[PDB]
Every structure is written in structure tokens, then in C-alpha cells.
């Protein structure tokens, strides 16, 4: 069977983990120690791409390598055994039915391999952990257990691997690399620093130390060292079966001992021990990466002393406990609102490896990129609401004054890198969300003043969306966009997001919808540059068109201002109050986004214009009704056999998509999903929609795939077609996407079609048999039903974000508190009961639904509602129920207060 | 217990061989497959950076990864084994006393792995080689026999684990890289050609298929297939102990099945047999690398079908013997003439592997440097002469001229390369290795003629030796210099030679000796460009211009010409034949310099002027007397100890390197090498050096090192010091460098001293329990005494070419054979007598030195020479005897002709 959930916390059991190829759990602080484990204790350990403690890996590693964590046992009358079973001995049992019991147990946030050898009577249980310290470190505790009925004569040694440079080195230079390496032994430990480090940095000093050290339980330090990996290993020998454990060797070093220029492993042999029946021993190993040689005492008295690892491991607890209690679901669905909770923990997990250095992940190195400034703020908007208004007005800074924007993200907060000497790529998508973004942080918060404030423009020497480079730049003007006189030009974040969204409308193809340019959020949609379509994002860039218009107009009943401050060059993309042109002319449309682009580079003049927030809104809302029109009008599209949906891109012979083809129907989710959130999709279109999504699709083993196949490489659209079909970005079930359908669905009223989609990610993960993965959405489901690229995912901030304002319906609009549950029938637990914990206007609330009636969604109203013993009224705008900011802002900061919706039948 | 040779054509067995950590022997053609064989199958397959076949690895893969090449029997009553040992129960025995029996034999160039299991009685002989066909194929047979007293049944599996892409994919998009894999089955076995492929090139279309193939003795196809490796090893599994073979599962897949997405395995199932007690049965595996889908009938037909495979390992074994025959030594150290066997092959292996795709060499590409060129063509005068000529004529388009040369090799003939990521660097001792090649050319062949051939002269954005960046330049200039009139400028190539040679004698720093630029020979000094010098390589510079004045001399009375074709900008440069500058002044050497870069950027006039052969011998020798002085004078050093040698550097902050310092003594062997060889350094001087030597680097474990202990990183002179002292170009014993030592002591007289330094590189490299190396000289011997770098080292040719030209002493002398034997009492054999066969001026001479009165060297002369039977004149008394041409000439072409040249007191 696959892991099994214990207690109510959201720790799992996994039987005989590693029966199961290519799991990996992972270990993290804020601190920067990234880690990876398996259930043999193999993974990484790194703080970023030039600094790996242990060899870099992919996912083949992890059955390949024999370079685990390793902690081994010379047990008398047997002799070598590994605690986690990585060992030649053990391993050559997999597959005969002789296979020592075992179990993989996990939580927050924290691992546990156990094994238990029958022949000899002995049971290891190795616990792993990255504290909640200021450290970059790791901590290891074995504890041995006499489970027989005589004592038991051992003699451990511990063996971390060491690897100790970047990941340019793996094999490129390796040797020579190995060559660099000072080995240092102490009192506890093994300290290895490199003398230079040759990366694609070039060749420079290092002072950057990799350490690992230990003591027993009492403080007791080890009795010597195997620093060298070939003197550990033997002649002829490997890390997973070494000759000074196999043969039970003396330490070939003791403390103060210095070697150079080899491959090492922190190897320490612990004294023998006589363990009696029933009693046990335990050890604490550290693994530590500092920027200079380690103060050896310190990290002793911190972590190796007595109590310290127990003590750090309940610290590491608590902290988890209070980041994840920010949002807890509860159910009829028990195990899915524990799932749940480890879907709570992965967004938090995107940002501390920077989408990087866990297996699957074997191509990033440490950064951000745009999309996850905006997609970061989504699960900190619901978890951690204070920093989200400093690092959206930080983003800003980043937008180029054709609406583009910088791509590569640096060290302080709004600094952005140009990339001067590479051909760069703009994905079209970029622009679109911002602002969606933004608008959930003005209808959570109610900071309408944001919108106000000002911010620079990026500019570096690419101009008219990277078509050109520019003459007339030089290092000396700065990354920064220059008026006429030489002054930083600033701009309202309103005028940003205006910028970002009204260029596209105009930069369209030679079928009326927008260029794809490099891609859109398919980064495998990249081979159509020069006359590819998006007119999947189009019909996002519509709908926030409309938004934007309804936003202004809202702005003005609420605000009291008439006027925007707005770049003087931007008004003729404002052709509205002016000269109006002709939105059917594509010509026309390009032409005026020249004017457009020559009247701002290399410079702006600095003038603004004061424009009719009203007027404004009017030029807004006649774009998004244009497109809407055109959308409909035109790329509608049916197959023979009946079902109808959205054509989603023209490929780079000018050619539409979707629709019929030899070999089959070809159809994309991502073609649907904005259509149907923003309201391209009438509720018509979105009904035929789903069936066809239903029908093209949906498998019955897989769930709703990305696309449908298309036959073979498709080279004049995108290398996602490369890969086989069902895997990544071509027709896997890609759960960000999938996800985004789903909220769409929720969105439009389409309550049941929703759920099916959202309990159809759950299952899958879920079915262990097929995932193969912990508890977590991952990337994405592939052919054969397996979880990959788990953990880092973007879909898991949609998930939790969908979970908590569509399907509990907790919201807000303007800053007050919105309730409209589109919770179905079965969601409801045996009391009729179902709740969400979540932080709004800084106060944790209990919302609980309560159904006693028992009716299904559409069937149920609003009928009361209590806040923490006393009544509310709820001045209900449309279908649900609305509370004022003031009586959240009025209940006490300390504790959850509660707040009961009742539901009943309705009439007639 | 090291390996022991067996045979006389230098074939060799070690017993246990995978109780050795690092082992790895070379399998490799023409056509371009490069593999490499460990003792349990390991290593690695490929025809290039973007194309593995097999995973790309290092040194530690060899123990840390288990996808070995294997092959798997499923022996009833027993379980999963793997003939090679590389399975979990197995590597489970290592260090129990418990290890099967076990041995490697290798020869030329084929590899063969022995294992016996006891306890099912069942014997595995697994012979791997690469055909010497146009294809890029290795070929597997195994061999199972029953050595029991009854009957075993056994299933087979062969697993050869396949990557099939770019080494820029080992990690970065490695799984991402995996979904474009595209396996297709068929009857004999497993295809892999990714639909794209992602790597440094872009992403890009790819149609190269990785194939592995297989045949039971009879030509009888497999059962089966288990293609997709996560299905062959299971879940959980690994390619040591994979489920499929463990588990003894059905097949996967028949022929015309396709997967997509997987990372593949050329695993085939064979047919269950049942084996009589002391009877055998075999199977072929093929491992293939082609440009587009694979003609697997074709295959089949060639490689797979009844005894193909043994007939193509006699190919195989004929074409090296025929290849290594063009030189053998013979003497009374059998076991070291044997040696020198494979250390004649290496050559060989350099320029078929690039110098890359050997487990240690982990970071080569495949290309070639500026350095092969000139060095590839010492081992070709030898052993391939015919294409030596052609190679040279080329090479020297690559001058540029400054000087300096084009550092990056292209496809074609003289094809190089403008650099398009910035970032230049020069090599001070680049414009030195041309002349010393060409010359030893000149001798061995007499065609002079070749000096005076045309040529054209390198151009790219990098002008005054990559110092400054051109302003008059586009991609409309083109890679050639170009005359006033917009012509391609050409020269002679001696031209090109006075320009190397001289350009670096003005090129001083402010001790007036050749500046040190971005590195000399040694690529680890690399951080003194500023203000840094190779005084070592100035010795050099100093001897090839005297070795070019005497040349230009022996010219006109030879040829009898007595003028040279010179560009009219180069004339500056030759200052005693207009008004001569002061060599004494650094200002005005610089300043004269300085002007000849104005003259010549960015085009030169086209005028050329004809000067005076013997006026132009005179500036040369002038030049060479003045650095011989300067040499003498200022770079003689002596430590308090009284202890002599010659400073090698300069460093970045303008200090002297070697002499007395804070925690010893500072010495490099490089400093002491050119000023031998080239006779810059005296009699007296070389007596003195030699002790030096002996002194300070020579150490009784690990021989001659490259240099004495530098405390710490030396970040004002190189990154070589950031190694581990004893490794690499940080006191290592570095077989080059050492060689080349000899080499000059050779040279010079100093026979003894010459003979303990080859006689030093033979014993560690051999000295298997240390050095832990198959036969072959290393690129060096590392601080514990281990054989490093193995195979593709430069050192062998020098080696190769030190043992013939000055031990034997059978070297040209402007086309004519001059005999000078250098050879010691110690290396004649029992009946008084070594020799040597090899090629002269195409004809295969066994050259047979006989010393009956049994005399040191310098006790004996040469008393009489007979070719063939009939009497030689040696038209020479002093040195050694020299015979003329024609004789060789006028002798059969076919057959190995005696030469037995007598010696006496
Ligand atoms: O891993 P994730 O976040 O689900 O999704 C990943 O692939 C998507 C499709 O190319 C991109 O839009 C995301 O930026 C990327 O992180
Ligand atoms: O491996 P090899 O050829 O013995 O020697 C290697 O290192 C030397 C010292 O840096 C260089 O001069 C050679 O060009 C290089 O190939
Ligand atoms: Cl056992
Ligand atoms: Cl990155
Ligand atoms: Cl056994
Ligand atoms: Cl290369």
C-alpha cells in the first residue's frame, strides 16, 4: 500500500519506502540550506549551484549512485549494515523476498528512516532534520535498539559523502577540481576548503567550508576519521561498501591531521559500544556549509551537545505548526484536508530552493524568475499578508516602457539585471499577471492607494519589446528609463499595469489576436516567434481590459479622484480621446504601436498628461468589447463531431491550431481556462467548453490533460512536442493549468464541474500505486499515472488560493469580507460541518459552514451568520453574503474567533 | 601482484584486477568510436561531447555508479550473477576473503574479463574490442562454460545501459533530455534517437541513433527486450541488481515495439539454455553509434552472425600489429622493451581520442590545440611518415602576423578559428614547438624544399599578440591578413618560422628576459601575464635562433641559394641589417617591437624584399649570442647551500621565482630543460643543474618532480599551486616535462644521468602495486605514487622519440641516417647485443648494435657497419657514423633489412 496519514498534524507512514523508485522528501530553512532525501538517505545538500555539500543529482542518481548519507554498523557475528539499507549486502536482497522490514515516517518538517535487522536484533531509527536556526546546516540522529535477547557488540561509523564545489564541476573538470581540496580534521569532525574554485565564475580563491561532524548522545566525541574517499573506500571499493567498515579498519586520522588534494568523506568512527537487550545508543551528525573555515566548538555546543538535536527538532516543529496554521481546511474529506496541509507548505518551499536543487528540479540555479514575483505573492496574500504590499510595489520597477519587462532578478528588492550580450526572449504572458495579482491584494487588503504610488521603469539596451537594440545606450545612464532632461522617470503602478496590458492589444498578428512572441505561460510553446498567436491569452488580456475599466469607474465611487496621472506618449495607445482608429485594422493597430514605441525610445519627455478616469475606462472598456467580439466571433471553432470550444494559437505559418486534423483532434486546455475565468466564454460557450475539454481531454487514468496528441515534433510551434506525448508541457496532466480550469469553473458558477476537477488532482496524487509521490500536488501526472516535479510547483499557491476564495468562498472585495460557499453536498462532515481557518484584516476567523439540512449547492442560501456569539448583518451584493472590514478590524488581535454561517433550503 | 606480460607482442594478464581502484583500459578506430573498459565493464562509449552512448564519467563513477556494461546469467539453484562482477551480491564479497577468482588479459587493442563462480561451477570470459571497420561500433562476446559435474541451466541477459545524448546533460535537463527519447525494438535488438536534442548547440532536430544489438554464437536472435530501464530495474531497483534479471521476469518488449519518454537499456534476453559439464556457449553484443536510423539487417549480416565477431578481433589484432611494427625495441630489459610497446601506441590513441573521453580526461571535447599539431607530428615521422608534410604546410597558416597564432583548430586542412567569447589568451612557448618539429621533419626526410613553400598568415579581431582589439575590422575582413592592395598576403613558411622566433626575442619584461603572456608549456602559470617571465623559455628561444642561423647557413651550401623572400615590414625586426638597436635595452627592444606592430596592423604593404642568407644567419646568431650571454650572466643562481641552476620566472610582481626562500628552496625542472637541450647552459652548467636536480626535485618515491614545494596559492604567478602538492603541474612527477629532461641530457652528452631519468619513468609507471596503472607511461606520478592521466599524454611521443633518436641514436641528418648509439653496458642483452627496427626514408631497417668487448658508452666506438650482408661506408668519423641516403633508398621495399653495426674499445 502506499503512506498512510498518523495523527491529525499531517505526519505519514510509508511500508517498505524503497520498494518505490525516485522518492524524495525535502529539508529547508530560510537560512539557505536546501536539502533532499530519500528513503536509503540519498538526495543532496547544497546552498546554491556553486556550493553542493553532496554530490549535485537528477532522478537516475537516486538508484544509481551509491553516494548516500550513510551511517554504518560492524556488527559482531555479522558485520557490516547500513541503517537505512544502502549497503551491496542489503540491496542484493531487493527482489528475492528477504527484504528487512522497513519505513519512510515524515512530517513538518522533518524525516525518519527505520530498518530492522532480524538475523542480528537490531532496529535503527535515522531521523533528519534542517533546524530553524541561522545556520546552513543539517542535522542526522541514528538511534541504535538491542531488540534481541543477548548483548550486542557494535561499532558504528558514520559517512556523508562530500562533494564541496559547484555543479559546473560534476563532471566537467571534475578531477582536476578534486585536486583544489584541504581536508581538515578536528575534535568533532572533518572540514573541507577548498583552496581555489574553478566554475563558470572563472578561477578564483574560495574560502567557503563544507563540514561534518558528530559526537554520541553524551557529547562523546568520535574515535576517529576516514576524511580521504578512496583510503574509506579501498581498493577496488564504494561508498556502499567500504573497506574500512567492512573491514572493521582503524581510523586512518585523528584530530589535527591536514590532507590535500583529494575527494572527500566525512567519515567518523565512533567507539565500540556493548548494547544491552532492550537498551539504546544514539549519535548526532551535522553537515554544515559556511562561508569560512567553521568554529568547530560552536557548531558542538549548538547541535552535538546533549538535548540539542531533541531540542532543535521541537523548535523546527513549532515553527512549521505556526507557519502552516495559518490555513486549515476541515471536512467530510479527512485525508485530503491533511493532503491539504502539505499542499500549504509548498509555496513556502518554491521560495526557500528558488524552483531548484531538489532531483527532478536538476536544471535551476537558485533565482526567480517574473512569474514568481507575482506568484509568490498569492500564497503570502493568505499566509503572511504584511510583506506582500512592500515586494508588489518592488515589482513594478521591473516593467520596460513598451510593457515588457526584465526577466532575469537580482539580489535587493526591485533589483533587475540586464543581459546585455544574450538574444533575448519575451513571453507575452508577462504582462497579463500583474495585474491579477494586484487586484487580489486590493480586494484583500482594501489599499486602493496603492495604485497611486509612483515607480521607475526598467530600460536596458533592448527596446520595441527586444526587436531592436538601441544606438544610444551606455553603461553610464543606468537600468533605469530617462526623461528628456536626464531624470529618472517615474510613474503610478496604475500607469504600469495600463502599460503592460494595453500594449499587447495592439501587438497582434496576421489573424487579429495576439503574438505568442517567445511564449506564453507554455515555456514549450517557443518555436513561433515571428507569426505565432496566443489566443489563449488573449482572452486574458481582454478580460483584464474590462476589469481595469470596471476597476477605474469603481475607483471614482469609492476614492472620490477623477484623474490619472499618465505618461504623455501613452495617450496615443489611449486612441479614444483623440483621434480614434480603426481596431478591425491590424495594419492600423501596428502602426500606432510604432508611433508608440519611437515616441519613448531612447527617452521619454517627462510631460504627463491628466486624464478622465471615466474617459479612460470608456478607451478600456471599447478594447475589451472589441476583443470579446472578436473572440467570439471568430475563433470559435467546431468539430465535425459536435463539440465546440476555443481555437487557443496559430502556429508559426500562420496557421489555426485547434480543431480537425489527420490523426486526430487537436484541442488545449490553456485555450479554454482564460477564456471561461475572464468572461470571454459566454455561460453557453463555457457549457459546451467542458464537454469538449470532457471529451478531448479528460482520461480516464491520467485526468484532464494539457492537449491533445498532436502526431510527432511540431517545429513550427514549440519543443514541448519533442517530449513523448503525456509528459511535461505536452498532454500530461499539468496540474497549474489544471488547477487554473478548475478555479475558472468555480469562478462562472460551475460548482460541479469544478469540484470533479479539483477532486480529480487530489486522487491522482493521491493513488499512490500510480503517484508514487509523499503527500503534495506535483507538476504534473504523466502517461503512466506517475507524480513528477514535486513539491516546488506553482499549482500548489492556486490550489490553496482556489481552495480558500472559490470553494469555501472566503474572499475579499474592496477590503470587506465576502462569504459564498460553493461547497458540494458530500464536502460536508458528519455534523453537517465544514470550516476553514484563515488570516484576514489581521485576525485569524473559523468560518464554519453549517448544512443541516443537507441540501446540495444551488439548493442552499444564506440563512444567519454569528460572529464569535453575536449576530451580523450581511448587506448581501449578489449571490453571497458581505461583512464590513470594521467588525473583523474590531475583534480582539490574540486568538481564532469564530464565525458560523448557517445554510438552508431555498424556496419556491 | 601487478600485471605480468605474456607472449612477446606485449600482451599481459593481472589477476583480482577490481581489488584496484581507477582502472581503465582504451578501446578506439578511425572511424570515431572512443570507449573505455574497466575490469567490471565500466567506463564509458561515445563519438563526441554531443554523442554518448554510454553515461559520460569520471574517475568516481568507476566505483559510484553502477551502469557498468553487463551481462547477467540467472544461473537455476543459484540466482542473478554477472559475468564482470558488478552485481550486489557480488561487490558484497569485496574485502570478506570471499571474492571469486578474476583476471583481465589485454592486448592490441582488445580487452578480455575472466570470473569464475565455485560454488554453481560456471566460468565467464567477456572479450570487448572496436572493430577496425568503417562503423562506429564496439563489439561484447561472452563465453559461459560449465565447470561443474552436471548440467546448469542458465538465461541470459545482456544490459548495456544507454544515455544517447550530449554530456551537457549529465544534470542540467537530464530527466527533461529523457522525454525526448524515442526506443524502437527489433529483431536483434535496441534503437535510441531522440526526437530533439537540448544541449550548448540549441535545441535542435536530432537523427543519431544509439544502438545495442545481440546474437547468440549461432546468429540465433533474442527472446526479448526490456528497453526502458526504470522497467528493467524495477521499482527500487538498479542496474546492479535489476529486478528483470533478479526476479528472472518475462520479456517487456518483441521486435516493433516504440517507447517514447524513457531513459533506455539495451537489454537483451536470450534464450534459456542448458549447458553439458565442460561445454561452452557464447553471445555478440554490438554497441552502436550512427547518423540516422541504424540498417540493423546490415548489422546483423556483418557483425552478429557466426563467427564474425572472432574474425573481426584477427582484423582487429592484425591492423595494431601492423600499426606498432614501424618501431620495436630489443634489448636486455625484456619486460621494459614490452612496455614500450603500448608506450608506442599512445601516440596513436592521442590523436583517435583528442585528448578527451577517457575517464580522467573529463573535461577534453574532442579537438585539437596548437601544441598537437606540431607534437602529433613526432610520433607520425616514425611511425605514418607520408602525411607529416602536409600537416606541417597546414599548421603554419595558423600564424598570425605578430607571432602569436590562432588557438582554436577547425575542421579542414589549416582551417582555425577567430574566437567569438572574448576573452584571448597567448601562450608564450607557442611560436617555440614549430621550428623544433619542422627542423627534426627537415632531418629525418632532407626536404629542405619545404621552407620555401607559400603560405597564408592568420588574422582576427586580436592584434600586437591579442594586447589590442582592431578597430578596422568587421566579419567583412575574413580570417586572413590581406595586403595594401586587398590581396591575401602569403610567405614562406620559413618566413613564418623567422617570425615566431624573433617576434618573442624583442617580447621582454623588465628583467630583459620573454615575457611569460598567459602561460608558457606549463598552462597551470597562468596568473603573471603583467609583469611575468619564462626565462625558461627564452633558453629555448636563444637555441632556435642559433639552430636558425646555423640552418640558413647549411641552406646555401646545401641548396645553394643565397637569399630570402622576407615581407619588407619584417626587415625592422632584423635591426643588424639596417641600424641596429641595443639588445641591452629593454626601452628599446619594446619600442622597436612597437613599430613592427604599426607596420604590419592591419595590413601589410605586400613588398617583399630579398635579403642576404648569410647577413640574415648573422641577426639570428647575433640575437642567440646575446640571450646565451644575458642568460649566463643574470639568470645563474646559486643557494647558500652552493647548489647551481638556472631561474625559470619571473613572477607577476616583477620577483624572481627559484632560489633560497622561507620553508625551502624554490626549483622548477622547467627552468633547467631548454637551457640544456638548446646549450644555453654549459658543461659545467648542465654538471651542476643535473645536482641541482638531483637535489632538490628528485624524490626517491615519486621521481623527478616538476618543481620543489611553493607553500600555499601563488595567485602572482599561477593556479597551478592551488593543487595539491605532488599533483598535476604541482610537483608532480610530470612525464613531459621529465622526458624532455632526459631528452636533453641525451642530447648533451650526459648519458648516465639521461639513463636514470627514462630508467625512473619506466620503474613507477611499472611499479604496479604504487603506480596502479595497465602498461603505458602516465601523464604524471602523483605525491602517493599512482599513475595519473593515463593513455593520451604527449609524453609518449617524446618518450617514443628519445628511446629512437638519441638512447638508440638512429636519426636523420638532413635526409641522410646518422647512427650515434647512446645505449649503456647494462642494456645489451645476454648474447651482447640491442637493437631496434623502424622506418628510414621508407624502407623498415633493423638496426643491430653488437658489443662483444662488452664497453660503457664512451668507452666504445663504431668499428664497422654491414647492410644486409655487404660493407657500408660511414662518411663520418666524429659523433657517430653517418650514411648516405641513396643506400636505404636503393634497398627492396618489402622486407625488414639488417643493419648490424659492430662496436668495440
Ligand atoms: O512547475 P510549475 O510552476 O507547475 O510550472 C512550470 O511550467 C509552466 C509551463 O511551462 C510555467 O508556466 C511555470 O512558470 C513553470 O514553473
Ligand atoms: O597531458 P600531457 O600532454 O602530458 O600535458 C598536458 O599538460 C602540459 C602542462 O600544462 C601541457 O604543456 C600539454 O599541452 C598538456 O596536454
Ligand atoms: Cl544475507
Ligand atoms: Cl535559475
Ligand atoms: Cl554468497
Ligand atoms: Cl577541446
Known amino acids: 500500500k502506499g503512506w498512510k496519514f498518523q495523527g491529525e498534524q499531517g505526519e505519514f507512514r510509508l511500508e517498505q519506502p524503497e520498494h518505490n523508485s525516485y522518492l524524495y522528501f525535502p529539508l529547508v530553512n530560510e537560512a539557505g540550506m536546501m536539502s533532499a532525501?530519500?528513503?536509503?538517505?540519498?538526495?543532496?545538500?547544497?546552498?546554491?549551484?556553486?556550493?553542493?555539500?553532496?554530490?549535485?543529482?537528477?532522478?537516475?542518481?537516486?538508484?544509481?549512485?551509491?553516494?548516500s548519507r550513510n551511517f554504518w554498523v560492524f556488527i559482531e557475528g555479522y558485520g557490516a549494515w547500513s541503517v537505512s539499507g544502502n549497503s551491496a549486502r542489503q540491496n542484493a536482497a531487493r527482489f528475492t523476498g528477504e527484504e528487512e522490514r522497513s519505513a519512510v515516517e515524515?512530517?513538518?518538517l522533518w524525516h525518519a528512516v527505520t530498518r530492522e535487522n532480524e538475523k542480528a536484533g537490531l532496529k535503527a531509527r535515522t531521523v533528519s532534520f534542517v533546524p530553524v536556526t541561522d545556520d546552513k546546516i543539517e542535522l542526522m540522529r541514528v538511534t541504535l535498539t538491542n531488540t534481541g535477547n543477548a548483548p550486542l557488540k557494535l561499532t558504528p561509523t558514520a559517512a556523508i559523502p562530500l562533494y564541496g564545489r559547484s555543479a559546473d564541476d560534476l563532471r566537467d573538470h571534475r578531477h582536476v577540481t578534486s585536486l583544489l581540496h584541504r581536508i581538515f580534521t578536528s575534535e568533532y569532525g572533518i572540514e573541507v576548503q577548498p583552496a581555489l574554485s574553478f566554475d563558470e565564475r572563472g578561477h578564483r580563491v574560495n574560502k567557503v567550508t563544507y563540514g561534518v561532524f558528530g559526537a554520541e548522545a553524551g557529547g562523546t566525541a568520535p574515535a576517529g576519521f576516514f576524511?580521504?574517499?578512496?583510503?574509506?573506500?579501498?581498493?577496488?571499493?564504494?561508498?556502499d561498501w567500504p573497506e574500512a567498515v567492512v573491514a572493521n579498519r582503524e581510523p586512518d586520522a585523528q584530530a589535527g591531521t591536514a590532507v590535500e588534494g583529494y575527494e572527500a568523506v566525512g567519515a567518523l568512527r565512533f567507539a565500540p559500544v556493548e548494547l544491552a537487550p532492550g537498551k539504546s545508543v544514539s549519535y548526532v551528525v551535522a553537515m554544515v556549509i559556511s562561508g569560512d573555515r567553521i568554529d568547530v566548538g560552536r557548531y558542538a555546543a549548538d547541535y552535538l551537545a546533549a538535548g540539542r538535536f531533541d531540542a532543535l527538532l521541537e523548535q523546527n516543529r513549532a515553527y512549521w505548526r505556526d507557519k502552516l496554521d495559518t490555513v486549515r481546511f476541515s471536512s467530510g474529506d479527512g485525508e485530503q484536508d491533511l493532503w491539504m496541509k502539505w499542499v500549504t507548505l509548498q509555496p513556502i518551499l518554491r521560495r526557500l530552493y528558488g524552483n531548484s536543487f531538489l532531483p527532478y528540479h536538476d536544471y535551476g540555479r537558485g533565482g526567480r524568475g517574473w512569474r514568481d514575483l507575482w506568484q509568490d505573492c498569492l500564497a503570502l496574500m493568505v499566509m503572511e499578508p504584511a510583506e506582500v504590499r512592500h515586494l508588489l510595489?518592488?515589482?513594478?520597477?521591473?516593467?520596460?516602457?513598451?510593457?515588457?519587462?526584465?526577466?532575469?532578478?537580482?539580489?535587493?528588492?526591485?533589483?533587475?539585471?540586464?543581459?546585455?550580450?544574450?538574444?533575448?526572449?519575451?513571453?507575452?504572458?508577462?504582462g497579463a499577471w500583474p495585474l491579477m495579482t494586484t487586484l487580489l491584494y486590493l480586494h484583500q487588503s482594501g489599499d486602493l492607494d496603492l495604485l497611486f504610488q509612483p515607480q521607475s521603469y526598467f530600460r536596458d539596451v533592448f527596446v520595441k519589446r527586444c526587436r531592436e537594440r538601441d544606438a544610444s545606450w551606455t553603461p553610464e545612464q543606468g537600468n533605469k528609463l530617462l526623461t528628456a532632461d536626464?531624470?529618472?522617470?517615474?510613474?503610478?503602478?496604475?500607469?504600469?499595469?495600463?502599460?503592460?496590458?494595453?500594449?499587447?492589444?495592439?501587438?497582434?498578428?496576421?489573424?487579429?489576436?495576439?503574438?505568442?512572441?517567445?511564449?506564453?505561460?507554455?515555456?514549450?510553446?517557443?518555436?513561433?516567434p515571428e507569426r505565432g498567436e496566443s489566443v489563449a491569452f488573449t482572452a486574458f488580456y481582454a478580460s483584464n481590459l474590462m476589469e481595469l475599466s470596471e476597476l477605474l469607474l469603481e475607483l471614482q465611487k469609492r476614492t472620490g479622484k477623477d484623474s490619472l496621472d499618465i505618461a504623455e506618449e501613452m495617450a496615443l495607445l489611449l486612441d479614444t480621446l483623440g483621434k480614434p482608429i480603426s481596431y478591425d485594422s491590424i495594419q492600423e493597430k501596428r502602426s500606432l504601436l510604432d508611433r508608440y514605441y519611437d515616441a519613448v525610445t531612447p527617452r521619454v519627455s517627462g510631460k504627463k498628461l491628466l486624464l478622465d478616469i471615466r474617459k479612460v475606462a470608456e478607451d478600456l472598456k471599447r478594447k475589451a468589447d472589441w476583443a470579446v467580439a472578436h473572440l467570439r466571433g471568430s475563433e470559435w471553432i467546431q468539430s465535425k463531431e459536435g463539440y465546440a470550444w476555443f481555437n487557443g494559437y496559430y502556429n508559426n505559418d500562420g496557421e489555426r491550431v485547434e480543431g480537425?486534423?489527420?490523426?486526430?483532434?487537436?484541442?488545449?486546455?490553456?485555450?479554454?481556462?482564460?477564456?471561461?475565468?475572464?468572461?470571454?466564454?459566454?455561460?453557453?460557450?463555457?457549457?459546451?467548453?467542458?464537454?469538449?475539454?470532457?471529451?478531448?481531454?479528460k482520461d480516464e487514468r491520467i485526468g484532464y490533460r494539457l492537449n491533445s496528441r498532436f502526431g510527432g515534433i511540431q517545429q513550427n510551434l514549440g519543443r514541448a512536442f519533442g517530449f513523448a506525448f503525456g509528459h511535461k508541457e505536452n498532454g500530461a496532466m499539468f496540474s497549474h493549468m489544471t488547477v487554473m480550469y478548475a478555479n475558472a469553473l468555480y469562478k462562472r458558477g460551475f460548482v460541479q464541474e469544478g469540484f470533479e476537477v479539483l477532486d480529480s488532482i487530489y486522487?491522482?496524487?493521491?493513488?499512490?500505486?500510480?503517484?508514487?509521490?509523499?503527500?503534495?500536488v506535483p507538476e504534473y501526472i504523466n502517461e503512466r499515472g506517475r507524480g513528477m516535479y514535486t513539491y516546488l510547483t506553482g499549482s500548489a499557491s492556486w490550489l490553496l488560493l482556489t481552495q480558500l476564495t472559490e470553494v469555501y468562498g472566503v474572499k475579499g472585495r474592496f477590503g470587506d469580507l465576502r462569504l459564498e460557499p460553493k461547497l458540494v453536498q458530500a464536502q460536508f462532515d458528519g455534523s453537517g460541518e465544514a470550516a476553514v481557518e484563515?488570516?484576514?484584516?489581521?485576525?485569524?476567523?473559523?468560518?464554519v459552514y453549517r448544512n443541516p439540512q443537507a441540501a446540495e449547492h444551488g439548493q442552499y442560501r444564506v440563512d444567519s451568520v454569528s460572529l464569535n456569539g453575536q449576530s451580523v448583518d450581511c448587506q448581501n451584493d449578489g449571490a453571497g453574503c458581505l461583512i464590513g472590514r470594521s467588525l473583523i478590524e474590531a475583534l480582539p488581535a490574540d486568538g481564532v474567533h469564530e464565525l458560523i454561517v448557517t445554510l438552508g433550503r431555498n424556496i419556491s
Do not use: C
Not at 227 to 239: H, R, Y
Not at 511 to 516: S, T
Open 37 to 67: 532525501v530519500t528513503p536509503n538517505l540519498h538526495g543532496e545538500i547544497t546552498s546554491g549551484h556553486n556550493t553542493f555539500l553532496m554530490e549535485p543529482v537528477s532522478a537516475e542518481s537516486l538508484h544509481n549512485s551509491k553516494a
Open 106 to 108: 515524515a512530517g513538518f
Open 227 to 239: 576524511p580521504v574517499t578512496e583510503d574509506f573506500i579501498g581498493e577496488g571499493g564504494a561508498l
Open 393 to 430: 510595489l518592488n515589482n513594478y520597477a521591473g516593467v520596460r516602457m513598451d510593457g515588457s519587462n526584465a526577466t532575469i532578478i537580482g539580489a535587493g528588492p526591485g533589483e533587475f539585471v540586464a543581459d546585455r550580450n544574450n538574444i533575448p526572449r519575451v513571453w507575452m504572458d508577462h
Open 486 to 528: 536626464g531624470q529618472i522617470y517615474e510613474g503610478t503602478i496604475l500607469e504600469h499595469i495600463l502599460l503592460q496590458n494595453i500594449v499587447p492589444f495592439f501587438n497582434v498578428g496576421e489573424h487579429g489576436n495576439i503574438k505568442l512572441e517567445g511564449a506564453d505561460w507554455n515555456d514549450g510553446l517557443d518555436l513561433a
Open 660 to 697: 480537425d486534423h489527420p490523426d486526430g483532434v487537436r484541442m488545449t486546455l490553456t485555450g479554454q481556462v482564460f477564456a471561461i475565468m475572464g468572461g470571454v466564454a459566454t455561460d453557453e460557450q463555457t457549457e459546451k467548453i467542458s464537454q469538449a475539454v470532457n471529451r478531448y481531454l
Open 763 to 776: 486522487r491522482l496524487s493521491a493513488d499512490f500505486e500510480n503517484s508514487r509521490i509523499y503527500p503534495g
Open 838 to 847: 484563515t488570516l484576514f484584516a489581521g485576525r485569524m476567523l473559523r468560518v
